[PDB]
Amino acid sequence: DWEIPDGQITVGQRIGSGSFGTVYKGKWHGDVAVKMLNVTAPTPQQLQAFKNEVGVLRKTRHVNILLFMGYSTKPQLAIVTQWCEGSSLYHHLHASETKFEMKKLIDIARQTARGMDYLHAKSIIHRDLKSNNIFLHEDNTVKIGDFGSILWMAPEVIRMQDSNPYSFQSDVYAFGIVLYELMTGQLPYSNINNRDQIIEMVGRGSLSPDLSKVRSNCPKRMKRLMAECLKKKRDERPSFPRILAEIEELARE
Ligand SMILES: O=C1CCc2c(Oc3ccc4c(c3)[C@@H]3[C@H](O4)[C@H]3c3nc4cc(C(F)(F)F)ccc4[nH]3)ccnc2N1
């Protein structure tokens, strides 16, 4: 079982605080990272907001997913993961002037590919793939997870067609936008300066990322796979085994 008895985890420094919960850096047989719920007695609605997150976590065992280690029940509900060190891909590309090199941009794209590939085989749809949900552990090892947003939302997701628009292809579209960030350097819709403008225009297909902003030494394979991931219709996008294959094939240069 993965339940961690009360008192085993010395909850150390607070890292991030949200209205929902709070992420502390902790100590348990080494450095860990605990995500707690700021409620004494949780409602059944949020009870299994915790029970569900756990399930999808204990199903993962990949180098490029955040390592689940266990969960606490008392005194408050808590998820326990490995303790990563460094910044997210977002901090690196947009908040810091990280002088990233082409080989390493491809490698980050490749690790993310492998990571997202593994989720899909386990039939796990992320629903929020983005640059700041991708942690660069030791500024090398990519760890995918939920570390907390419309810029990565596919047109059909922006429209909220029916109930859930979230699918494997929604993650594919998001992945493209990550490739866009790696290959251009900036975020998409850099010139549009209104959130409500991005939602409306993408919703009618009148707006899409500017693909003429990528680096010069952006490999043509990657330029085209990027386009393929951003096809406006969900069923035109490539699946991750296709993607992993393509990226890994060009990475061997
Ligand atoms: O500097 C920092 C602060 C944030 C942080 C960490 O924050 C977290 C601590 C605990 C924690 C999380 C994030 C979220 C929850 O519990 C982790 C999580 N991983 C997930 C992976 C998935 C998926 F991969 F899609 F299956 C889904 C939900 C997930 N939730 C953990 C490790 N290193 C760092 N680095």
Please check whether residue 84 is in contact with residue 13, taking contact to mean a CB–CB distance below 8 angstroms: no
β-partners of residue 197 are: none
Contacts of 90 (CB under 8 A, 6+ apart): 130, 131, 132, 134
Please check whether residue 35 is in contact with residue 47, taking contact to mean a CB–CB distance below 8 angstroms: no
Return the closest-CA partner of residue 246 out of 63, 134, 114: 114
Q: Distance between CA atoms of 154 and 168, rounded to whole angstroms? A: 11
Return the closest-CA partner of residue 151 out of 167, 123, 125, 132: 132
For ligand 1, mutation pick of 9, 11, 23, 91 (most atoms within 8 Å of CB) = 23
Q: Which two tokens stand for residue 174?
A: 């998001």
Measured in Å, residue 146 CA sits from the centre of ligand 1 at 5
Contacts of 156 (CB under 8 A, 6+ apart): 165, 170, 234
Please check whether residue 132 is in contact with residue 90, taking contact to mean a CB–CB distance below 8 angstroms: yes
Give the resolution to one decimal, in Å: 3.5
Residues in binding site:
15-23, 35
Measured in Å, residue 60 CA sits from the centre of ligand 1 at 12
Count of C-beta atoms within a 10 Å radius of residue 195: 11
Q: Which two tokens stand for residue 245?
A: 């294959």
User: Which residues line ligand 1 at a C-beta cut-off of 6 Å?
Assistant: 15, 23, 33, 35, 53, 56-57, 60, 65-66, 79, 81, 83-84, 119, 124, 126, 144-147
DSSP state of 176: H
Q: Which residues are catalytic?
A: 128
Measured in Å, residue 147 CA sits from the centre of ligand 1 at 5
| Nearest alpha carbon, ligand 1 atom 19 | 145
Please check whether residue 185 is in contact with residue 135, taking contact to mean a CB–CB distance below 8 angstroms: no
Structural domains of the chain, ranges and CATH numbers in brackets: 1-85 (3.30.200.20), 86-253 (1.10.510.10)
Please check whether residue 155 is in contact with residue 76, taking contact to mean a CB–CB distance below 8 angstroms: no
Please check whether residue 16 is in contact with residue 22, taking contact to mean a CB–CB distance below 8 angstroms: yes
β-partners of residue 134 are: 144
Given the CA of residue 59, which atom of ligand 1 is nearest to it? 26
Task: Please state whether beta strands 134-137 and 86-88 pair in parallel, antiparallel, or not at all (unpaired).
Answer: antiparallel
Q: Which two tokens stand for residue 45?
A: 């609605």
Measured in Å, residue 164 CA sits from the centre of ligand 1 at 23
Q: Distance between CA atoms of 105 and 103, rounded to whole angstroms? A: 6
Return the closest-CA partner of residue 222 out of 245, 242, 250, 241: 250
By what method was this entry solved? Answer: X-ray
Please check whether residue 176 is in contact with residue 109, taking contact to mean a CB–CB distance below 8 angstroms: no
- Phi, psi values for residue 153, rounded to 5°: -85, 125
Q: Distance between CA atoms of 128 and 165, rounded to whole angstroms? A: 12
